[PDB]
């Protein structure tokens, strides 16, 4: 029957194969947001434009639900580690979790980043 | 930079235009009133205290007697130069019209074109 293999990475910089969880669904949301980004911005401007009458702005408000899915909302998107998919402990400037980042730094696989003391 | 083949650096597009007021007055024969009005329109540079980033497209420096214009509206280096040159001509046209002065070959050349406006 059908199969859906877990997303895993085999890289020479790490002695073990690295597995991840739940990156496909978050990618689907990011694509949908880009799909409806233009229309969302137009309706945001109209609903916060005081020169328009309230009866017209109320009708525009209903377009946020009838003309686009709820999963295109930018507030429902989270940043996961690109290698493991973990949400908590993420280091944004590198895109990796603190667990993976620390080990890679020790072996010089992150450009310019080294231990500090002062 | 290492990522040149994957993304265009955002700082390639901006351009700046500088002109010395004393030379500009001599070339176009601007009167004293016209020069004074031009300086007032420009004014000193304004930098936001939150980031210390210049936010004034046009400003005047008294120590160097220089009028500067910054153009970064578009993504192309050349398109910003075309924008900056047009804006400089607009300022000259406004100041000259209010306070007409001497006539010079440069002023006659621009007048025939119409200041490209």
């Amino acid at each position: 029957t059908t199969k859906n293999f877990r997303l895993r990475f085999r890289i020479p910089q790490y002695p073990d194969i690295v597995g991840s969880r739940r990156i496909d669904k978050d990618q689907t949301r990011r694509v949908l947001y880009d799909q409806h980004e233009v229309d969302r911005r137009l309706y945001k401007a109209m609903t916060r434009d005081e020169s328009l009458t309230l009866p017209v702005r109320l009708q525009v408000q209903r377009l946020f639900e009838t003309e686009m899915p709820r999963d295109s909302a930018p507030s429902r998107i989270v940043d996961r580690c690109v290698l493991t998919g973990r949400v908590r402990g993420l280091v944004k400037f590198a895109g990796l979790s603190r667990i993976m980042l620390r080990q890679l730094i020790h072996y010089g696989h992150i450009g310019g980043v080294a231990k500090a003391s002062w | 930079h290492a990522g040149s083949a994957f993304m265009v650096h955002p700082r390639n597009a901006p351009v700046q235009l500088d002109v010395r007021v004393s030379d500009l007055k001599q070339e176009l024969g601007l009167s004293d009133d016209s020069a004074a009005l031009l300086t007032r329109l420009a004014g000193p540079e304004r930098l936001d205290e939150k980031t210390k980033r210049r936010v004034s497209p046009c400003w005047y420096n008294s120590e160097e007697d220089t009028l500067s214009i910054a153009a970064d509206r578009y993504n192309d280096r050349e398109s910003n130069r075309r924008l900056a040159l047009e804006q400089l001509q607009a300022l000259v046209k406004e100041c000259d019209t209010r306070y007409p002065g001497e006539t010079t070959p440069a002023k006659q050349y621009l007048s025939g074109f119409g200041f490209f406006q």
Binding site: T47, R48, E50, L54, R57, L58, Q61, R62, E65, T66 | -
Partner: protein, 92 residues
């Protein structure tokens, strides 16, 4: 709360439910509701974040609380509040 100049918020799904209800019972909607007759039926909804409007008067709402639809009949004193303030989710 929501800025007053931006108007009240009401869900599109809730409005469609009321519109269907009015079509089913035109006589009560036009006349009966004002005399004081009770609604012939109830409307179940999940819209706990919608505001109660003056136009919702004499209607019976079954508001979901996680397990069942708790009945809520709209009174004049309830206008301006959310439907979720009259349907309790926790029990002691």
């Amino acid at each position: 709360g929501r800025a007053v100049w931006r108007g009240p918020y009401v869900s599109v799904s809730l409005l469609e439910q009321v519109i269907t209800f009015a079509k089913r019972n035109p006589e009560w909607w036009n006349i009966g509701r004002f005399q004081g007759s009770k609604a012939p039926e109830a409307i179940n909804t999940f819209c706990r974040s919608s505001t109660v409007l003056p136009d919702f008067l004499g209607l019976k709402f079954g508001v979901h609380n996680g397990r069942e639809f708790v009945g809520v009949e709209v009174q004049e004193a309830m206008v301006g509040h959310k439907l979720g303030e009259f349907s309790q989710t926790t029990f002691r």
